[PDB]
């Protein structure tokens, strides 16, 4: 799955402040978390296609969120990417 | 030639014919009869009358074989099933319990085109 613990820990990480949950950064982290989880899922199970749909979508979201952050503040974008380490 | 005297009567009733098999409390048959065990040859074995005469054959036979009480069981839906049980009602045999056993499957096997949809 993903435990309560794990999700917490990743936010209590990427949050812009105390109480941050919905920040662009954070969502991007979640989506990556979730992604990697699902990609490893389809490392086996190369036949579960209906989940693949989801992967494709979660990827799309991640990408838009990234692009926005870049458009807005290139600094925190580079920083975020150079944390999660993807496509940058 | 064992003198059974208590047993099962099996009515198997198809759109095409009827068979009574008389067996013992353990299920081994004692005697039997059918559409064309009596005269009838073609379709005519389906008629309920065919069933009466057949049922009574199976009785009378079993009765000289020594039997009085029987337990009826019925497989299949078909004309003159009821007529077969009827025949047994007063066959001279005490009809202890009628019962309906017709196998239904849980959808295993793919029917002959005749029986589909």
């Amino acid at each position: 799955p993903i435990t309560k613990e794990e999700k917490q820990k990743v936010i209590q990480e990427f949050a812009r402040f105390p109480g941050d949950t919905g920040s662009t950064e954070v969502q991007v982290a979640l989506l990556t978390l979730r992604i990697n989880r699902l990609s490893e899922h389809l490392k086996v199970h190369k036949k579960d296609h209906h989940s693949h749909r989801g992967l494709l979508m979660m990827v799309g979201q991640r990408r838009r969120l990234l692009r926005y952050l870049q458009r807005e503040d290139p600094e925190r974008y580079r920083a975020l990417i150079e944390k999660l380490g993807i496509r940058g | 030639k064992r003198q059974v005297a208590s047993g099962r009567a099996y009515i198997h009733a198809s759109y095409n014919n009827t068979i009574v098999t008389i067996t013992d409390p353990d299920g081994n048959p004692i005697t039997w009869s059918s559409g064309g065990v009596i005269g009838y040859k073609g379709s005519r074995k389906g008629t309920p009358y065919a069933a009466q005469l057949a049922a009574l054959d199976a009785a009378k036979k079993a009765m000289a074989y020594g039997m009085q009480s029987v337990d009826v069981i019925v497989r299949g839906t078909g004309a003159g099933r009821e007529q077969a049980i009827r025949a047994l009602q007063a066959s001279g045999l005490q009809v202890k319990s009628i019962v309906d056993d017709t196998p239904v499957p849980h959808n295993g096997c793919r029917p002959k085109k005749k029986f589909r949809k």
């Binding site: - | 019925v74 319990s97 009628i98 019962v99 309906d100 056993d101 239904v104």
Partner: protein, 71 residues
Amino acid sequence: RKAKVKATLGEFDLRDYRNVEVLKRFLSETGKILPRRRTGLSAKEQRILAKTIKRARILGLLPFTEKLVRK
């Protein structure tokens, strides 16, 4: 048009695949699981009762099918 199943029974876990005469009270004189028309449950109720019965059958607690008496 007799009277409806759930009306008889008191409170019962509808999840109990261990619990029988409560369960058997949901089946035909053949093994057959009973219609809502006859049981008087709800969409969800009947729905859980199903899996419950089936779980129980597999366990050898409830009958998969039965013979039919008279006829």
